[PDB]
Design a protein around this motif. Sequence first.
Motif, PDB file in Angstrom:
ATOM      1  N   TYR A  53     -64.916 -18.174   1.579  1.00 14.80           N
ATOM      2  CA  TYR A  53     -64.053 -18.119   0.211  1.00 14.80           C
ATOM      3  C   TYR A  53     -62.620 -18.426   0.825  1.00 14.80           C
ATOM      4  CZ  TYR A  53     -67.537 -17.853  -3.650  1.00 14.80           C
ATOM      5  OH  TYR A  53     -68.314 -18.047  -4.367  1.00 14.80           O
ATOM      6  N   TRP A  86     -62.415 -12.754  -5.455  1.00 12.26           N
ATOM      7  CA  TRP A  86     -63.566 -12.468  -5.010  1.00 12.26           C
ATOM      8  C   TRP A  86     -63.686 -12.105  -3.640  1.00 12.26           C
ATOM      9  CZ3 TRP A  86     -67.033 -11.981  -8.680  1.00 12.26           C
ATOM     10  CH2 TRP A  86     -67.001 -12.699  -9.770  1.00 12.26           C
ATOM     11  N   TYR A 105     -65.167  -8.643  -2.345  1.00 13.53           N
ATOM     12  CA  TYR A 105     -66.165  -8.621  -1.488  1.00 13.53           C
ATOM     13  C   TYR A 105     -65.693  -7.802   0.042  1.00 13.53           C
ATOM     14  CZ  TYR A 105     -69.840 -11.763  -3.299  1.00 13.53           C
ATOM     15  OH  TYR A 105     -70.960 -12.071  -4.176  1.00 13.53           O
ATOM     16  N   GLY A 163     -65.269 -14.799 -13.362  1.00 14.51           N
ATOM     17  CA  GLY A 163     -66.994 -15.290 -13.518  1.00 14.51           C
ATOM     18  C   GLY A 163     -66.906 -16.412 -14.473  1.00 14.51           C
ATOM     19  N   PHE A 204     -65.822 -19.416 -13.092  1.00 13.63           N
ATOM     20  CA  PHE A 204     -66.667 -19.946 -12.125  1.00 13.63           C
ATOM     21  C   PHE A 204     -67.761 -20.833 -12.850  1.00 13.63           C
ATOM     22  CE2 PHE A 204     -68.180 -19.292  -7.516  1.00 13.63           C
ATOM     23  CZ  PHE A 204     -69.226 -19.853  -7.417  1.00 13.63           C
ATOM     24  N   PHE A 205     -68.427 -20.323 -14.105  1.00 13.99           N
ATOM     25  CA  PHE A 205     -69.278 -21.108 -14.679  1.00 13.99           C
ATOM     26  C   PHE A 205     -68.688 -22.298 -15.263  1.00 13.99           C
ATOM     27  CE2 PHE A 205     -73.330 -20.521 -17.258  1.00 13.99           C
ATOM     28  CZ  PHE A 205     -73.118 -21.477 -18.304  1.00 13.99           C
ATOM     29  N   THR A 239     -68.234 -24.953 -12.208  1.00 18.51           N
ATOM     30  CA  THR A 239     -69.496 -25.436 -11.833  1.00 18.51           C
ATOM     31  C   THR A 239     -70.022 -26.460 -12.612  1.00 18.51           C
ATOM     32  OG1 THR A 239     -69.616 -23.047 -10.710  1.00 18.51           O
ATOM     33  CG2 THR A 239     -71.699 -24.505 -11.371  1.00 18.51           C
ATOM     34  N   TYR A 240     -70.143 -26.115 -13.790  1.00 18.11           N
ATOM     35  CA  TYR A 240     -70.687 -27.283 -14.863  1.00 18.11           C
ATOM     36  C   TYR A 240     -69.885 -28.247 -15.288  1.00 18.11           C
ATOM     37  CZ  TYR A 240     -74.626 -24.003 -14.315  1.00 18.11           C
ATOM     38  OH  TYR A 240     -75.315 -23.071 -13.726  1.00 18.11           O
ATOM     39  N   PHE A 284     -70.720  -9.404 -12.367  1.00 13.19           N
ATOM     40  CA  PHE A 284     -71.723 -10.081 -12.803  1.00 13.19           C
ATOM     41  C   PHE A 284     -73.020  -9.912 -11.908  1.00 13.19           C
ATOM     42  CE2 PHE A 284     -68.586 -12.423 -15.000  1.00 13.19           C
ATOM     43  CZ  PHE A 284     -68.843 -12.715 -16.302  1.00 13.19           C
ATOM     44  N   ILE A 329     -80.116 -23.126 -19.213  1.00 14.59           N
ATOM     45  CA  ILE A 329     -79.191 -23.718 -18.265  1.00 14.59           C
ATOM     46  C   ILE A 329     -79.917 -24.355 -16.874  1.00 14.59           C
ATOM     47  CG2 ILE A 329     -77.216 -23.252 -16.864  1.00 14.59           C
ATOM     48  CD1 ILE A 329     -76.550 -23.273 -19.638  1.00 14.59           C
ATOM     49  N   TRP A 332     -84.904 -15.551  -8.367  1.00 16.44           N
ATOM     50  CA  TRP A 332     -83.983 -14.393  -8.435  1.00 16.44           C
ATOM     51  C   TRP A 332     -83.548 -13.671  -9.691  1.00 16.44           C
ATOM     52  CZ3 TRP A 332     -79.244 -12.426 -10.194  1.00 16.44           C
ATOM     53  CH2 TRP A 332     -78.775 -11.439  -9.434  1.00 16.44           C
ATOM     54  N   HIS A 352     -79.849 -16.377  -2.106  1.00 15.49           N
ATOM     55  CA  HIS A 352     -78.686 -16.536  -3.116  1.00 15.49           C
ATOM     56  C   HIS A 352     -77.359 -16.304  -2.566  1.00 15.49           C
ATOM     57  CE1 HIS A 352     -76.861 -14.916  -6.715  1.00 15.49           C
ATOM     58  NE2 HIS A 352     -77.515 -15.977  -7.255  1.00 15.49           N
ATOM     59  N   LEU A 385     -75.088 -19.638  -3.042  1.00 15.82           N
ATOM     60  CA  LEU A 385     -73.815 -19.295  -3.885  1.00 15.82           C
ATOM     61  C   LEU A 385     -72.627 -19.824  -3.026  1.00 15.82           C
ATOM     62  CD1 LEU A 385     -72.471 -18.234  -6.501  1.00 15.82           C
ATOM     63  CD2 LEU A 385     -72.629 -15.884  -5.400  1.00 15.82           C
ATOM     64  N   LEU A 408     -72.703 -23.628  -3.092  1.00 13.70           N
ATOM     65  CA  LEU A 408     -72.376 -24.180  -4.255  1.00 13.70           C
ATOM     66  C   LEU A 408     -70.543 -24.185  -4.577  1.00 13.70           C
ATOM     67  CD1 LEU A 408     -73.650 -24.619  -7.577  1.00 13.70           C
ATOM     68  CD2 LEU A 408     -72.548 -22.327  -7.699  1.00 13.70           C
TER      69      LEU A 408
END
Length: 436
Positions: A17, A68, A72, A89, A92-93, A96-97, A155, A172, A376, A396, A400, A403
């Motif tokens: 990141y 993040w 982390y 979050g 992020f969604f 992403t889309y 999340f 989704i 998952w 995952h 992640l 992605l």
Amino acid sequence: SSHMDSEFRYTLFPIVYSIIFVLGVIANGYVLWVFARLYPCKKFNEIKIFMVNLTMADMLFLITLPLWIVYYQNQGNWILPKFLCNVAGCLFFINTYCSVAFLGVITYNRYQAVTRPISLVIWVAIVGAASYFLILDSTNTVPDSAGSGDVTRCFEHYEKGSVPVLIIHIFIVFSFFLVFLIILFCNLVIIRTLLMQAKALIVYGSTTGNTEYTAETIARELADAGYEVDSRDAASVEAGGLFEGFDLVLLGCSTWGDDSIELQDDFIPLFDSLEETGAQGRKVACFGCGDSSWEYFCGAVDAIEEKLKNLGAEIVQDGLRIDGDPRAARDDIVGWAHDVRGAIAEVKRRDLWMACTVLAVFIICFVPHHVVQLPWTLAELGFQDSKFHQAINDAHQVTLCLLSTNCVLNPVIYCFLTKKFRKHLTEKFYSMRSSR
Ligand SMILES: CC(C)c1cc(C(C)C)c(-c2csc(N(CCN(C)C)Cc3cccnc3)n2)c(C(C)C)c1
Ligand SMILES: Cc1cc2nc3c(=O)[nH]c(=O)nc-3n(C[C@H](O)[C@H](O)[C@H](O)COP(=O)(O)O)c2cc1C
């Protein structure tokens, strides 16, 4: 108690990141620099303002990454206000889309270009999706790697109680695979239609046989190089959809007239009815014979070239103009037919590389995570084995952060798109804004 965790994520995420944050910012910066350079004039302030607004959006996501990193770094503990977790979050969604939709739109439009060259906005959608996150209680507390110390997760839990996780996740993941399928077959059809062997048609109007010779030399050049060459005299052709099913059309005509710049007798019937063939959106080349002793040296070349421009044809190369005898400069003729190929080859290479890129991004970035998601989510909900839970959780963590590489790859795609699809894009932008 059920300490299902991947210890490597606390070291894997801060490094990845922080690398995708600097590479992300650099990538986005290299776009703006290159774009603001290619459009320096104020007449293009609206296309530049759009490019700024695109960078601003990408940047709104890039600023979530430090949260993040810190989350982390302190072993998966969201110390900051809870509503910030919903915000981080949710973005992020959305990122992403939106990154998925945009790689989809690039593919669809290149599809409508490489093939078939003859309610819409999802604003309403991302409003309901975002307002869902605004109320979502994203945070759960669980004891630390040791015990007797609450560590807040962002999340990471699924409250089986009120939120219908299963259907939302199923919908989704299936919506993604529908989109991926569309990208997959759009691109494979693009690759296939580009790799299709090129069929060229040469139409010449010759009296003394000079344009005929040039047409023959050009025909032998393309045929040698693997084209499906159709060389025909203007007196043996009919204007009724003559260019239909041809990739490249090469029109040749000698200049005539004691008084003005007149065309060859057999070629004039074709010239007047050049719309009926299919000139618009057609890759065309124009050669011709003449003499420098007259005022309009190869006037017929310039006559059909400006007429095809008015017809909206794709003049891929600067027209061939021969002074006197064509045998005198056969190597100069061949050069023009070689360059004509070269210029059409680059446009093909442009779309080949783009189709491959959008697939390579999809197969390595988005697809691996969306395969991992459904198993998952079930494991997390407690529908699988213990050994499997550890495996799907570990993969995952890998999928992640793969992605997340969209940060760096989508601006790279935007760069290559600006650099090589400039003409097409600039036209497209100013057509939509011309009304609304
Ligand atoms: C619908 C489904 C396919 C989907 C669901 C979520 C939810 C967990 C909200 C999310 C999502 C939103 S925020 C987020 N994470 C990963 C949490 N995961 C362990 C469950 C937060 C996050 C972001 C970046 C790095 N680490 C954690 N995941 C995503 C993104 C990949 C777009 C997709
Ligand atoms: C009366 C006459 C007028 C011509 N007019 C032009 C002219 O305006 N511009 C030009 O470049 N060549 C002109 N030409 C030269 C021809 O284009 C030349 O002969 C050509 O190389 C032969 O081509 P073709 O054998 O394929 O018809 C003219 C020739 C004649 C005889």
